[PDB]
């Protein structure tokens, strides 16, 4: 865990945010609010347990507790909800903006120091462990608070103060026809870990394209599967963390709730004497398995100890070259092992030495693995995956041992096999050409389950109670027309090459 995330959005309640160079372009307030909607939807599906708030500045009215003028808070730091989405969308649009300007003011003098006070106080309100005091704001101009030198000085003083307090903030470039005026008033006063300010950005060219994009995932935090241990012989033991860099996600379980109250009704379940109508007890339980006629009775710890073979841990078997593993031999999704000094101190040194040595030897680690108590231990192989970096020196692959599992004899399922049949080499060349026609470079993040996407689409659609639900796009459908036009007549050429001209492959 080690902290949580929270963002607060700041919108200039002025008239510059309520115009457009051309009607094809929305107002700054318009694309800001729609990007806010997209961000909130993403947070709900991704990390709904975070904190989000909305505050406005420059408006005529105000709502902050300290009651600084022009400082109207809209929403406080809370887990996002569809109600907030509705509150935002009631003013999102070419007329909802007018509704907002009617029921709410816009355009007045203020001090950025005041909004910084308000946001700092809002930070003070939250109490859970917190890690990312990210602040987001939206405008296309900087100099209005540089107009008053005293206002500029106090604003930059408070900005330095909040930077000292660990607060991090980010601004979106908005389309100002005369240029946002980078480097004039903000990047010297705002918090940046890097400098790319080169163009005063007459347009809104910054990272809205990423933010408006909707993501659909869960992004489970880095949680150690176990600090399980490797028993070398009987006493040489090291502490290593267990991880799964891939973990099959699935649709969240439903919650059974009422009809007219919609309340999730608790469901107590028990067992009673059917022959009597009385009541039975968990102690009054006996499991049976009848093979033919004889009935055999087993109990709780009776069924437990049959699963008992050894203590949960890793028991080294030996070493074998990596090549001696058949690729088609697969059991289930692989695991990953990372060292740790939390329990066994110096175990990281041993892990590094083993990784380097076995990488030199090109050998695999054979070991007996017991996940937890009362489980049959299974043999596994630890292939050393070296940490690989990129042009950005980011870990495209972390260091450690990828944990692949070794199937047993029962796993092997033989099938009715046939003889070996060969093919003419010219047909093989035709296949090579046809493959080259439709070849491409695979990338892992280029594909996704459309079924869960459609599930989400429906979920937020009924949440947003529109006329129609959003339609997900299947990225797993082949481009049949594109592939066919890309191949040409080679398809039918090989069809007559191999398949009989009179007999189609269809029966």
């Amino acid at each position: 865990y080690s902290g949580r995330d929270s963002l607060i959005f700041l919108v200039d309640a002025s008239k510059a945010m309520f115009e457009s160079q051309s009607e094809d372009e929305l107002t700054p307030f318009d694309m800001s609010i729609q990007c806010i909607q997209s961000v909130y939807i993403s947070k709900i599906i991704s990390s709904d347990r975070d904190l989000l708030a909305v505050v406005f500045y420059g408006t005529e009215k105000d709502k902050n507790s300290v009651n600084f003028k022009n400082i109207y808070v809209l929403q406080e730091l809370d887990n996002p909800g569809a109600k907030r989405i509705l509150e935002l969308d009631q003013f999102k649009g070419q007329q909802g903006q007018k509704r907002f300007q009617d029921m709410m003011g816009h355009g007045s003098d203020y001090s950025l120091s005041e909004v910084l006070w308000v946001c700092a106080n809002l930070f003070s309100d939250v109490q859970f462990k917190m890690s990312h005091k990210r602040i987001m704001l939206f405008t296309n101009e900087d100099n209005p608070h540089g107009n008053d030198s005293a206002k500029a000085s106090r604003a930059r003083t408070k900005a330095g103060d909040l930077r000292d307090t660990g607060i991090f903030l980010d601004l979106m470039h908005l389309k100002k026809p005369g240029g946002f005026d980078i480097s004039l008033f903000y990047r010297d006063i705002i918090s940046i870990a890097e400098d790319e300010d080169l163009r005063v950005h007459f347009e809104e060219s910054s990272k809205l394209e990423d933010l408006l994009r909707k993501v659909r995932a869960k992004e489970t935090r880095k949680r150690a599967l176990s600090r399980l241990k490797l028993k070398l012989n009987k006493d040489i033991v090291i502490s290593v963390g267990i991880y799964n860099l891939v973990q099959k996600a699935l649709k969240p379980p439903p919650i059974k709730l009422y009809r007219e109250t919609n309340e999730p009704v608790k469901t107590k379940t028990r067992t009673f004497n059917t022959s009597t109508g009385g009541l039975l007890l968990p102690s009054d339980t006996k499991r049976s398995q009848i093979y033919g006629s004889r009935q055999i009775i087993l109990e709780k710890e009776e069924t437990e100890e049959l699963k008992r073979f050894d203590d949960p841990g890793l028991m080294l078997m030996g070493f074998k070259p990596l090549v001696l593993l058949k690729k088609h031999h697969y059991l289930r999704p692989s695991l990953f092992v990372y060292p740790e000094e939390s329990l066994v101190i110096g175990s990281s040194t041993l892990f590094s030495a083993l990784l380097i040595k076995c990488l030199e030897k090109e050998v695999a680690a054979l070991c007996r693995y017991t996940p937890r108590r009362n489980i049959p231990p299974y043999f596994v192989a630890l292939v050393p995956q070296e940490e690989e970096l990129d042009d950005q020196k980011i870990q495209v692959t972390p260091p450690g041992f990828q944990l692949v599992f070794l199937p047993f004899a029962d796993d092997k399922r033989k099938m009715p096999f046939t003889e070996k049949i060969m093919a003419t080499p010219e047909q093989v060349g035709k296949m090579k050409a046809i493959v080259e026609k439709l070849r491409f470079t695979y990338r892992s993040d280029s594909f996704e389950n459309p079924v869960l996407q459609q599930h989400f689409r429906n979920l937020e659609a009924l949440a947003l109670d529109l006329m129609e639900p959003e339609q997900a796009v299947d990225l797993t459908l082949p481009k049949v027309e594109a592939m066919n036009k890309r191949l040409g007549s080679l398809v039918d050429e090989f069809k007559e090459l191999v398949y009989p001209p009179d007999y189609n492959p269809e029966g």
């Binding site: 107590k268 379940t269 067992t271 007890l281 102690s283 710890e301 437990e304 100890e305 108590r373």
Partner: protein, 232 residues
């Protein structure tokens, strides 16, 4: 079901310990519903919530016959639970709150039934006799000692065994720290000695236990332990 349930349960328990037989006679249905909710096959309540066992310890009513009928169900449940717990082979000897709570339950329940006329008597004998080492100020041993002290009588004709082991374990228990454990062990001492004397005095083999149990330790005594020796 959390600290709310914990505090409410202790409140009502001490209420019965205070309010004793004035109007608290609308509890038979309450007792039945508590027994039923125990039969919830999902043991999701925490061990701390298992002081519901002390709930079944009930004396504020006349203890109607229906409570007697359900008492056998209760006892069987406790026996199954305890035999499940004490099996350290399954590496689940964890009954920290369970043991003392079922102890108090048996304490306030045995006042009506379970005379020394059946096998379950020696069963629960063996169950308690197992009193592997403990920690955390040793609450469960004190609970067991208090239970035995209150109901040493029911263990007749089968408590004479293990007499040396019982005596030495009681000695060390009253010699250990946590003076509350000391006095609980002392009470167990007096109850045990009283019961063994009563059963020996009308025995026929009394000389065997006599010369094999008592004068040697008594002489070897010669601290508050001296008072126990004199009583012995």
């Amino acid at each position: 079901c959390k600290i709310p349930a914990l505090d409410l349960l202790i409140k009502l328990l001490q209420t019965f310990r205070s309010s004793r037989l004035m109007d608290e006679f609308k509890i038979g249905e309450l007792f039945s519903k508590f027994y039923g909710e125990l039969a919830l096959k999902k043991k999701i309540p925490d061990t701390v919530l298992e002081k519901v066992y002390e709930l079944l310890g009930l004396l504020g009513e006349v203890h109607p016959s229906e409570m007697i009928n359900n008492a056998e169900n209760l006892f069987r449940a406790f026996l199954g639970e305890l035999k499940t717990q004490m099996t350290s082979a399954v590496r689940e000897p964890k009954l920290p709150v369970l043991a003392g709570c079922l102890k108090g339950l048996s304490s306030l329940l045995c006042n009506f039934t379970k005379s020394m006329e059946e096998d379950p008597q020696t069963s629960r004998e063996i169950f308690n006799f197992v009193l592997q080492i403990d920690l955390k100020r040793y609450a469960v041993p004190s609970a067991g000692l208090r239970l035995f002290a209150l109901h040493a009588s029911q263990f007749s004709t089968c408590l004479l065994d293990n007499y040396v082991s019982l005596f030495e374990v009681l000695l060390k228990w009253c010699a250990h720290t946590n003076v509350e454990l000391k006095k609980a062990a002392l009470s167990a001492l007096e109850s045990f000695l009283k019961q063994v004397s009563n059963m020996v005095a009308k025995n026929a083999e009394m000389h065997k236990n006599k010369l094999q149990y008592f004068m040697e330790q008594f002489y070897g005594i010669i601290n508050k332990e001296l008072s126990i020796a004199i009583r012995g």
